[PDB]
């Protein structure tokens, strides 16, 4: 009687070999018992194949084939070592996968192919190569980060799949944050996109991930930036360009869809107050000139070229005053996000009440009023006929005051009739009159 089935024939053959001879080859034994287990577990093949199984339309078969060829190129270039031509091939293949429309239409197939894990692997290899001597191939690193950021935006499920590597990304957060024109193309931005506008993921986010960012921010406050002072920027004791990215990530972690995630906000504010050095030289508390004085001295830095500029391609020029002002604005914005909601305060939760007390202790109301009281400069028409523009990346910016107003509304509370008109007089009326003065078409 013949076995009549491949599974039965294999089941007989493999056991027969094993009982006929003692196998001296570990790989032979491995393959033997793997095949036997497969034969006696046919359901395993189905339960492994069905998740990988996908169904596609005949009209989109061609674009699917093109995307699959690109994926295969990337998979083989994983196995090959990393070089310049390999970086070019990575860039071109990633661009092709972007331009493929099936990529947008079917994110589920994209997950089933494990493409995000492939990009993760190649980025891990390139980051591991040359860890202490600065990340080589930063262009492809940025391409991979942009790919992973787009993957998060495609669908919510892609965000949940991206979430499970948040630990590695936070470990490798400090890669190219200092370098400008790389914004939005770093592992920190990848993690921010993974946790962006996903309340489920924000709630699932753990405390150690937050405290790691807090430690990075404290380091950025005690220690200067090395490669900025290497290019020759004037040495200051702290690193606002690095700090602001962590502040933005914490903002994305704590504030979601207009509502403040209190469970994250509480942990973040406790870590921030436990490490008071994260705030900065203004908010040292000991010998600190205050936030208002800090922004006035930063404006003076902005007018002085030697103190704002490196003073030893345009993106290399990092305006130190603008960076410091953006750092303080981001810190204030993060604290405003961490401020609890009004309905919980009406209920009278002691935790939220003491959180508001801590926030008020950290930030005096006078500094906030003074920052709004500060006015900025008017672009003016010249004799020849050209309106001269002060730099948008250097000097006072409206978002800085937007963060102040956000904190003032979310923390201190505008319910005093005379204080409202005092705030009007000090900081709103000049701004409105400047807006009314720039209302000509050339200034519009």
């Amino acid at each position: 009687k013949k076995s009549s089935t491949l599974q039965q024939l294999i089941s007989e053959t493999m056991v027969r070999w094993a009982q006929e001879s003692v196998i001296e080859d570990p790989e032979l034994v491995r393959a033997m018992f793997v095949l036997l287990h497969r034969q006696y577990d046919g359901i395993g093949g189905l339960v492994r194949a069905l998740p990988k199984t996908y169904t596609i339309n005949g009209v989109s078969v061609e674009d699917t084939i093109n995307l699959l060829a690109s994926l295969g190129q990337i998979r083989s270039l994983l196995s090959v070592r990393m070089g310049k031509e390999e970086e070019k091939l990575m860039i071109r293949g990633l661009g092709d996968i972007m331009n493929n429309k099936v990529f947008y239409q079917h994110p589920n197939l994209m997950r089933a192919l494990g493409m995000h894990e492939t990009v993760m692997e190649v980025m891990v290899n390139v980051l591991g190569g040359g860890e202490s001597k600065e990340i080589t191939f930063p262009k492809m690193v940025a391409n991979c980060c942009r790919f992973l950021c787009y993957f998060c935006r495609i669908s919510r499920q892609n965000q949940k799949a991206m979430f499970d590597h948040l630990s590695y990304l936070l470990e490798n957060s400090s890669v190219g944050l200092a370098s400008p024109a790389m914004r939005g193309s770093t592992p920190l931005d990848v993690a921010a996109a993974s946790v962006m506008d996903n309340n489920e993921l924000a709630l699932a986010l753990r405390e150690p991930d937050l405290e790691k960012v807090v430690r990075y921010l404290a380091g950025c406050g005690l220690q200067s930036c090395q490669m900025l002072v290497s290019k020759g920027y004037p040495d200051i004791g702290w690193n606002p360009v690095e700090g602001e990215r962590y502040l933005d990530f914490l903002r994305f972690a704590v504030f979601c869809n207009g509502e403040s995630v209190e469970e994250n906000a509480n942990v973040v504010v406790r870590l921030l107050i436990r490490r008071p050095e994260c705030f900065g030289p203004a908010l040292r508390g000991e010998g600190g000139n205050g936030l208002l004085a800090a922004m006035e001295e930063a404006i003076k830095i902005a007018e002085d070229p030697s103190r704002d500029g490196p003073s030893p391609e345009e993106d290399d020029t990092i305006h130190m005053g603008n960076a410091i002002m953006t750092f303080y604005s981001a810190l204030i914005d993060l604290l405003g996000r961490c401020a609890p909601e009004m309905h919980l305060i009406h209920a009278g939760k002691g935790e939220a009440i003491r959180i508001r007390s801590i926030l008020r202790s950290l930030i005096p109301l006078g500094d906030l009023v003074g920052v709004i009281s500060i006015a900025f400069q008017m672009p003016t028409i010249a004799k020849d006929g050209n309106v001269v523009e002060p730099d948008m990346s250097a000097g006072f910016c409206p978002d800085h005051k937007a963060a102040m107003v956000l904190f003032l509304d979310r923390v201190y509370g505008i319910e005093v009739q005379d204080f409202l008109l005092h705030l009007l007089e000090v900081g709103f009326l000049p701004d409105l009159r400047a807006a009314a003065s720039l209302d000509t078409a050339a200034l519009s």
Partner: protein
């Protein structure tokens, strides 16, 4: 080359030279493969494939060189695509069924219709007089039909010869006779060049009784060495994978 059987140092040096030839073009280095096509030609490759009196080390090195020059890249790509089961829905996919006829009898593995998406096979002509650099992409072209017939005929003769347990195997040992030939057949079958009656006949060669479509001892019961058994295991793994793919396609057809 047949004289090199008694010059041991030259034999060893040439075997390591062939290993270097494989190493330089390993892992899809198409430019190096095209360059090596000049040094090792198609007729030399085929004669090394066919010659019985070849030394075992040189024979294994030459099969490895052929596979690594022409065949390795597409074999690896299709192996990477093996696990995924992207299936279009067309009329053929709808016509796919679990069982061929009314009674519940499993058809021969690989035989039938398979409408799952597959990588495209591309090849380049190894010409050194043309200046166009686009030839440095893709693998160099080889006569796959001749290679397939070559291989089936050699495998049939090897199966006939070895069961006699003669003291003069091709290459001097049963391992040298079988491991490289079965490796080449594995590579071809993974590519899927084998179609219809060729697959039927070589599955009959693997096992006459079980795979009879409607005495001589098969490659399963031929009392094989350990590496040859490992390659047999790989072949059976591929057959089971084909079974699973057919099952998935029929499931989608019902779906």
């Amino acid at each position: 080359i047949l004289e090199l059987t008694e010059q041991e140092e030259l034999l060893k040096f040439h075997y390591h030279t062939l290993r270097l030839y494989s190493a330089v073009c390993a892992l899809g280095n198409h430019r190096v493969a095209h360059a090596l096509c000049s040094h090792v030609d198609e007729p030399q490759l085929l004669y090394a494939i066919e010659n019985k009196y070849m030394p075992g080390l040189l024979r294994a090195g030459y099969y490895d060189l052929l596979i690594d020059i022409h065949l390795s890249s597409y074999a690896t790509a299709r192996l990477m695509m093996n696990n995924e089961y992207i299936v279009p829905m067309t009329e053929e996919t709808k016509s796919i069924t679990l069982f061929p006829d009314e009674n519940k009898k499993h058809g021969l593995p690989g035989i039938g219709l398979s409408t799952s998406l597959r990588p495209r096979m591309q090849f380049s002509s190894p010409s050194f007089v043309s200046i166009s650099n686009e030839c440095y992409q893709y693998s160099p072209e080889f006569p796959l039909d001749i290679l397939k017939s070559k291989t089936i005929q050699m495998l049939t003769e090897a199966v006939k010869e070895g069961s006699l347990h003669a003291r003069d195997p091709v290459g001097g040992t049963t391992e040298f006779l079988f491991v490289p030939l079965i490796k080449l057949f594995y590579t071809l079958l993974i590519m899927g060049i084998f179609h219809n009656e060729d697959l039927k006949h070589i599955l009959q060669l693997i096992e006459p009784s079980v795979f009879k479509e409607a005495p001589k001892e098969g490659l399963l019961q031929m009392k094989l060495p350990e590496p040859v058994k490992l390659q047999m295991c790989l072949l059976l793994q591929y057959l089971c994978d084909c079974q699973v793919r057919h099952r998935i396609e029929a499931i989608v057809a019902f779906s």
